[PDB]
């Protein structure tokens, strides 16, 4: 299938497009809300600015697609393959991204307000400046992700892997970090006021760097904290 | 007895002067080492600059005596009554002051290196600038004493009462504060590095003000500390 076909069919009102092969397709600007594209092949595809609101893309191959600026509000991307995809400035508010593959993806300045990223793989992704206010990243992999100035105000990072994340100047206010791993993360000017830290693995450096006004702690943690300030116990 | 008598007798080599009444006596400059003056009455006496090295004064009435600049090195003042005495700049190194009465006394800039002040009463005394390097104040009363810039580097303040002390800019390095009470003390720029704090009662303010590099703590204390920095447990 090609473009003038598919634009036409949708325009008619045909909504099922599952398993279609659209690999490398030029679909910039293309307007495709409520479309069913599950299992569809979109390797290196161009869907820059494409409107995919409430679209179903679950298990779709999107590795290396340009999606810069797409609307994905409320789209179903459960298990969709997004390795290396360009999502800079895309809007994914309310989007379902559970168990989705986002390694190496460019997410700079994108919006994932209230998006479901449960167990998603974001190792090494660029989220510099993005917004995740109230998002679910319970159990996500962020091995090495870049989050300079990203907003996770109120996100579930319960048990998330933040191993070696860049959190420099990140916003973590009232986020849930219970049981998260933050070994190696850069926390310069990061803000964890009111955040829930209980049982998270942290470097001691974090105790000295992150604003922690109202942040919740273990007793093990209290101690950590004390000692990171140089008290002898 | 009067002065020309007593100077004479000592000069001969007479050493016992116990229970003698020398109340209000002018004995400035008077040179009286190894003298036994226990139970002697010296209310409002003038012994400014008097040399009393290794003198025995235990239970002597010294209330309101001028002793400014006296040598009391190694003198025995166990239970001697020093309420309101002027001791500014006096030297009491190695002096025994156990159970002695020092309320309201002027001790500004005096030297009590290694002096024994066990259970002594220093409520409301002025020790602004004094030196107590290695002194024993185990169980002393310092209710309200002024210790601006005083040096207690290494002193036993085990169980001492520091209720409302001025400790502004005091030196407490490797002092023992186990079980001391520091409710109300001013600790601005006070230094408690390597000090032993375990079980002492402190205001939380203290956690924020005193340098605590290497200071020892309880777990209760670790927690205190954390919370004084605003962490929620």
- Specify the 3-state DSSP secondary structure of B12: helix
> What residue numbers bound the domain in which A10 lies?
1-233
Mutating which of B178, B194, B212, B222 best tests the A interface, going by the most A Cβ atoms within 10 A? B222
Continuous H helices in chain A: 3-12, 204-209, 219-228
Q: How far apart are CA A92 and CA A122, in angstroms?
A: 15
Query: Could you tell me the CA-to-CA distances from A158 to A105, A135, A162, A225 in Å, in that order?
Result: 22, 11, 11, 21
Q: How far apart are CA A196 and CA A183, in angstroms?
A: 17
| Both structure tokens of B45 | 């006496």
Q: Is B212 in contact with A219 (Cβ distance < 8 A)?
A: no
User: Which residue in B has a C-alpha nearest to residue A174's C-alpha?
Assistant: B232
| Both structure tokens of A57 | 């893309």
Total number of domains in chain A: 1
The residue with tokens 């002025």 is B126
List the one residue out of A220, A161, A226, A171 whose CA is nearest residue A194: A171
Q: Which residues of A186-213 are buried (b: 16+ CB within 10 A; e: fewer)?
A: bbeebbbbbbbbbebebbeebbebbbbe
Technique employed here was: X-ray
Residues of B in contact with A231 (CB under 8 A): 212, 214-217, 221-222, 225
Chain A closest-CA separation from residue B232 CA (Å): 5
In sequence order, what are the residues at sequence separation of 6 or more whose Cβ sits closer than 8 angstroms to the Cβ of residue B155?
B132, B133, B134, B135, B136, B137, B172, B175, B176
A194, A225, A230 member nearest B214 (Cβ): A230
Residues of B in contact with A215 (CB under 8 A): 231-232
Chain B closest-CA separation from residue A232 CA (Å): 5
Q: Are the beta carbons of A191 and A173 closer than 8 angstroms? A: yes
> Which helix (H) or strand (E) covers residue B227, if one does?
helix B219-228
Q: Is A233 in contact with B213 (Cβ distance < 8 A)?
A: no
Per DSSP, A201 falls in state E
Q: Is B230 in contact with A217 (Cβ distance < 8 A)?
A: no
Resolution in Å, one decimal, please: 3.4
Residues of A in contact with B221 (CB under 8 A): 226, 231
Domain CATH code at residue B172: 2.160.20.80
Strands B181-182 and A181-182, sheet pairing: unpaired
Sign of CA dihedral B157, B158, B161, B165: positive
In sequence order, what are the residues at sequence separation of 6 or more whose Cβ sits closer than 8 angstroms to the Cβ of residue B32?
B10, B50, B51, B52, B55
> Which helix (H) or strand (E) covers residue B208, if one does?
helix B204-209
Q: Supply angle C-alpha B1, B66, B47, rounded to 5.
A: 45
Q: How far apart are CA B17 and CA B8, in angstroms?
A: 13
List the one residue out of A150, A63, A135 whose CA is nearest residue A103: A63
Q: Is B226 in contact with A230 (Cβ distance < 8 A)?
A: no
Residues of B in contact with A216 (CB under 8 A): 231-233
Query: Could you tell me the CA-to-CA distances from A11 to A4, A17, A21, A154, B36 in Å, in that order?
Result: 10, 13, 19, 40, 116
Chain A closest-CA separation from residue B141 CA (Å): 27
Q: How many CB pairs under 8 A join A and B?
A: 69
A212, A219, A223 member nearest B230 (Cβ): A212
């Amino acid at each position: 299938m090609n473009v003038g076909e598919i634009l036409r069919h949708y325009a008619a009102g045909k909504r099922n497009f599952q398993h279609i092969n659209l690999q490398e397709i030029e679909l910039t600007n293309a307007s495709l809300t409520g479309a069913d594209l599950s299992y569809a092949n979109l390797h290196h595809a161009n869907l820059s600015r494409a409107n995919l609101r409430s679209a179903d893309l679950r298990n779709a191959n999107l590795s290396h697609a340009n999606l810069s600026g797409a609307n994905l509000e409320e789209a179903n991307l459960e298990a969709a393959n997004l390795r290396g995809a360009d999502l800079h400035e895309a809007n994914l508010s309310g989007a379902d991204l559970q168990e989705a593959n986002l390694t190496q993806a460019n997410l700079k300045d994108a919006n994932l307000s209230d998006a479901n990223l449960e167990q998603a793989d974001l190792a090494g992704a660029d989220l510099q400046g993005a917004v995740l206010d109230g998002a679910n990243l319970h159990g996500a992999d962020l091995n090495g992700a870049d989050l300079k100035q990203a907003d996770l105000s109120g996100a579930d990072l319960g048990g998330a892997n933040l191993n070696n994340a860049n959190l420099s100047e990140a916003m973590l206010t009232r986020a849930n970090l219970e049981q998260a791993d933050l070994s190696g993360a850069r926390t310069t000017g990061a803000r964890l006021d009111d955040a829930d830290l209980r049982g998270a693995t942290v470097d001691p450096v974090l105790w000295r760097t992150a604003s922690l006004v109202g942040a919740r702690v273990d007793v093990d943690q209290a101690v950590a904290f004390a000692a990171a300030h140089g008290l002898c116990l």
